[PDB]
Design a protein around this motif. Structure first.
Motif, short mmCIF file in Angstrom:
data_model
loop_
_atom_site.label_atom_id
_atom_site.label_comp_id
_atom_site.label_asym_id
_atom_site.label_seq_id
_atom_site.Cartn_x
_atom_site.Cartn_y
_atom_site.Cartn_z
N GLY A 29 -52.24 -2.76 -20.35
CA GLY A 29 -50.88 -2.77 -20.86
C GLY A 29 -50.64 -1.71 -21.91
N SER A 30 -50.09 -2.13 -23.05
CA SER A 30 -49.74 -1.23 -24.15
C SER A 30 -50.38 -1.74 -25.44
CB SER A 30 -48.22 -1.11 -24.30
OG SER A 30 -47.87 -0.90 -25.66
N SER A 31 -51.61 -1.28 -25.70
CA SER A 31 -52.21 -1.41 -27.02
C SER A 31 -52.37 -0.04 -27.68
CB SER A 31 -53.55 -2.14 -26.96
OG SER A 31 -53.78 -2.87 -28.15
N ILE A 32 -51.46 0.87 -27.38
CA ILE A 32 -51.29 2.11 -28.13
C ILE A 32 -51.20 1.73 -29.60
CG2 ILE A 32 -49.81 4.10 -28.55
CD1 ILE A 32 -51.18 4.27 -25.89
N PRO A 33 -52.06 2.26 -30.46
CA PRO A 33 -51.91 2.00 -31.89
C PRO A 33 -50.55 2.46 -32.38
CG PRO A 33 -54.04 3.00 -31.43
CD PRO A 33 -53.24 3.09 -30.16
N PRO A 34 -49.79 1.58 -33.02
CA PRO A 34 -48.44 1.95 -33.45
C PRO A 34 -48.48 3.14 -34.40
CG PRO A 34 -49.15 -0.06 -34.54
CD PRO A 34 -50.15 0.21 -33.45
N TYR A 35 -47.56 4.08 -34.18
CA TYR A 35 -47.53 5.29 -34.98
C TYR A 35 -46.10 5.62 -35.38
CZ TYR A 35 -46.40 7.55 -30.49
OH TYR A 35 -45.84 7.89 -29.28
N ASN A 36 -45.96 6.24 -36.54
CA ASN A 36 -44.67 6.69 -37.05
C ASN A 36 -44.54 8.19 -36.83
OD1 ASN A 36 -42.19 6.16 -38.99
ND2 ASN A 36 -43.21 8.01 -39.73
N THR A 37 -43.34 8.63 -36.44
CA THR A 37 -43.07 10.02 -36.13
C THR A 37 -42.02 10.55 -37.09
OG1 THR A 37 -43.68 9.90 -33.79
CG2 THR A 37 -42.09 11.59 -34.43
N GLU A 38 -42.37 11.59 -37.84
CA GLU A 38 -41.45 12.25 -38.76
C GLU A 38 -41.14 13.65 -38.24
OE1 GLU A 38 -40.99 13.65 -43.39
OE2 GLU A 38 -42.81 12.57 -42.81
N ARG A 62 -62.83 4.38 -33.89
CA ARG A 62 -62.91 5.09 -32.62
C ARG A 62 -61.54 5.32 -31.99
NH1 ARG A 62 -66.18 1.04 -32.63
NH2 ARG A 62 -65.56 -1.08 -31.99
N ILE A 63 -60.50 5.43 -32.81
CA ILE A 63 -59.17 5.79 -32.34
C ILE A 63 -58.86 7.21 -32.78
CG2 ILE A 63 -56.70 5.32 -32.52
CD1 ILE A 63 -58.38 3.40 -30.75
N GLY A 64 -58.48 8.05 -31.82
CA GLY A 64 -58.08 9.41 -32.12
C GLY A 64 -56.71 9.70 -31.53
N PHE A 65 -56.14 10.82 -31.97
CA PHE A 65 -54.81 11.23 -31.53
C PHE A 65 -54.82 12.72 -31.23
CE2 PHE A 65 -53.32 7.17 -32.78
CZ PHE A 65 -52.04 7.01 -32.29
N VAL A 76 -40.75 20.25 -26.93
CA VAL A 76 -41.40 19.17 -26.20
C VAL A 76 -42.73 18.88 -26.89
CG1 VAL A 76 -42.43 18.47 -24.01
CG2 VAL A 76 -40.29 19.79 -24.03
N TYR A 77 -42.99 17.60 -27.17
CA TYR A 77 -44.25 17.23 -27.81
C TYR A 77 -44.84 16.01 -27.14
CZ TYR A 77 -41.80 13.56 -30.55
OH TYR A 77 -41.08 12.46 -30.94
N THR A 78 -46.14 16.07 -26.86
CA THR A 78 -46.85 15.05 -26.09
C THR A 78 -47.93 14.43 -26.96
OG1 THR A 78 -46.44 16.20 -24.00
CG2 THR A 78 -48.23 14.59 -24.05
N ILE A 79 -47.98 13.10 -26.98
CA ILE A 79 -48.95 12.34 -27.76
C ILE A 79 -49.96 11.72 -26.81
CG2 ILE A 79 -49.25 10.17 -29.00
CD1 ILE A 79 -46.39 11.24 -30.35
N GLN A 80 -51.25 11.98 -27.07
CA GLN A 80 -52.34 11.46 -26.25
C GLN A 80 -53.28 10.65 -27.13
OE1 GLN A 80 -53.08 11.86 -22.62
NE2 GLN A 80 -54.24 10.09 -23.36
N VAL A 81 -53.29 9.33 -26.94
CA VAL A 81 -54.23 8.48 -27.65
C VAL A 81 -55.61 8.64 -27.03
CG1 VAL A 81 -54.55 6.19 -28.62
CG2 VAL A 81 -52.27 6.95 -27.93
N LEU A 82 -56.64 8.64 -27.87
CA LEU A 82 -58.01 8.87 -27.43
C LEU A 82 -58.88 7.68 -27.82
CD1 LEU A 82 -58.31 12.63 -28.45
CD2 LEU A 82 -57.81 11.69 -26.18
N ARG A 83 -59.43 7.00 -26.82
CA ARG A 83 -60.38 5.91 -27.02
C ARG A 83 -61.78 6.46 -26.81
NH1 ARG A 83 -56.42 1.87 -25.42
NH2 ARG A 83 -57.31 0.94 -23.51
N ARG A 101 -57.80 7.07 -22.05
CA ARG A 101 -57.68 5.80 -21.34
C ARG A 101 -56.25 5.30 -21.25
NH1 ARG A 101 -62.86 1.80 -22.46
NH2 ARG A 101 -64.48 3.28 -21.78
N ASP A 102 -55.31 5.93 -21.95
CA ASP A 102 -53.91 5.55 -21.92
C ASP A 102 -53.07 6.71 -21.40
OD1 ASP A 102 -53.52 2.74 -23.36
OD2 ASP A 102 -55.01 3.85 -24.54
#
Length: 86
Positions: free
Chosen positions: A1-10, A25-28, A63-70, A75-76
């Protein structure tokens, strides 16, 4: 599902900042590029809890793309967004 660590965007005139709660072990991975091209696409990876992209030009569609890294693994699904600098 969606366990993307919540993040704020400025989003400012020249900066894009992403912040989240640091975990061992969470990267962005963040990548920005103009929608119409013209300059180099930047890519930043961090575990500090913040990604900074400065030097952007105001008034340009990005255009900006966010990739969570496990464990350094994609994995997401990547999150593609678009914002115009103020």
């Amino acid at each position: 599902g969606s366990s993307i660590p919540p993040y704020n965007t400025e989003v400012t005139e020249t900066t894009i900042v992403i912040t989240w709660t640091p975990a061992p072990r969470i990267g962005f991975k963040l990548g920005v590029r103009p929608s119409q091209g013209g300059e180099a696409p930047r890519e930043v990876t961090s575990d500090s809890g913040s990604i900074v992209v400065s030097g952007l030009t105001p008034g340009v569609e990005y255009v900006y793309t966010i990739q969570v890294l496990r464990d350094g693994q994609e994995r997401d699904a990547p999150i593609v967004n678009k914002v115009v600098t103020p």
